[PDB]
């Protein structure tokens, strides 16, 4: 699964 902390700027929504 994606790591949401790889780029904090990305809101996966």
């Amino acid at each position, epitope marked *: 699964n994606p790591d949401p902390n790889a780029n904090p700027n*990305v809101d996966p929504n």
Partner: antibody, heavy 120, light 114 residues
Framework: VQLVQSGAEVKKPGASVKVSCKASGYTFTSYAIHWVRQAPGQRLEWMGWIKAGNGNTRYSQKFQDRVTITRDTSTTTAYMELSSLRSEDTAVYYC??????????????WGQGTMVTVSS | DIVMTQSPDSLAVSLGERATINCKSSQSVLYSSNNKNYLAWYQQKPGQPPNLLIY???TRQSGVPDRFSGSGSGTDFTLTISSLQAEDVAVYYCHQYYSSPLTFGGGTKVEIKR
């Protein structure tokens, strides 16, 4: 949205350099500023990010012991210090708001880049 | 490390022809639970920083001309320039934001034949 970096520098092998990144045109404290370097003929290399409001950081495994990213919220400026400079560190260093994808908006902005030359 | 591999390394086409750039990710960047591909495409002209063209694999960023389009899902991604214009000479990079560290492809240099 705008990112403005300090000018190019030369530093001896073993010394440190501290590149600056002044931001403007947006809410500084809401996003993370990344640092990415583009070495001669090599692909872009992510170094780390810093959360501008909070100050938390995450560093690439490459640049763990030698990089320190920091911010000053009052001047809207992020910094990247790289120490024990080595031959391979000559490169253009960018700060960037990489892929800011919010419910409200989507933007991606890069500083103009700062060329650091490691030389005696 | 998600390795991003682009192909071809460079491509020369005449003005107005179609340009196809391929990018393969060494693991899937699709999250099935939201059906999003954590992939972006960048354009870099000399003297300039990379410029974001596409994100979420196929969403063109505001202001990007309509001739740039991304497609693909999972590991196999494609940037298409439907009709190359002279100002499109640049290096094009793919980029993943699925896992840390963020990584970029090796670049595809697009040149004009004239």
């Amino acid at each position: 949205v705008q990112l403005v970096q300090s000018g190019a520098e030369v530093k001896k092998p073993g010394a440190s350099v501290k590149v600056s990144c002044k931001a403007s045109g947006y809410t500084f404290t809401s996003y993370a500023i990344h640092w990415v370097r583009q070495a001669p003929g090599q692909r872009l290399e992510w170094m780390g990010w810093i959360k501008a409001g909070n100050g938390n950081t995450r560093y690439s495994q490459k640049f763990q012991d030698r990089v320190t990213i920091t911010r000053d919220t009052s001047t809207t400026t992020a910094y990247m210090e790289l120490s024990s400079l080595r031959s391979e560190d000559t490169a253009v260093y960018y700060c960037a708001l990489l892929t800011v994808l919010t419910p409200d908006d989507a933007f991606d902005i890069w500083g103009q880049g700062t060329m650091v030359t490691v030389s005696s | 490390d998600i390795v991003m591999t682009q192909s071809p390394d460079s491509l020369a086409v005449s003005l107005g022809e179609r340009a196809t750039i391929n990018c393969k990710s060494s693991q899937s960047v699709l999250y099935s639970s939201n059906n999003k591909n954590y992939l972006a495409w960048y354009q870099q002209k000399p003297g300039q920083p990379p410029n974001l063209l596409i994100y979420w694999a196929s969403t063109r960023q505001s202001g990007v001309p309509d001739r740039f389009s991304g497609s693909g899902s999972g590991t196999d991604f494609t940037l298409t320039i439907s009709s190359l214009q002279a100002e499109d000479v640049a290096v094009y990079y793919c980029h993943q934001y699925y896992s840390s560290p963020l990584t970029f492809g090796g670049g595809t240099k697009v040149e004009i034949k004239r």
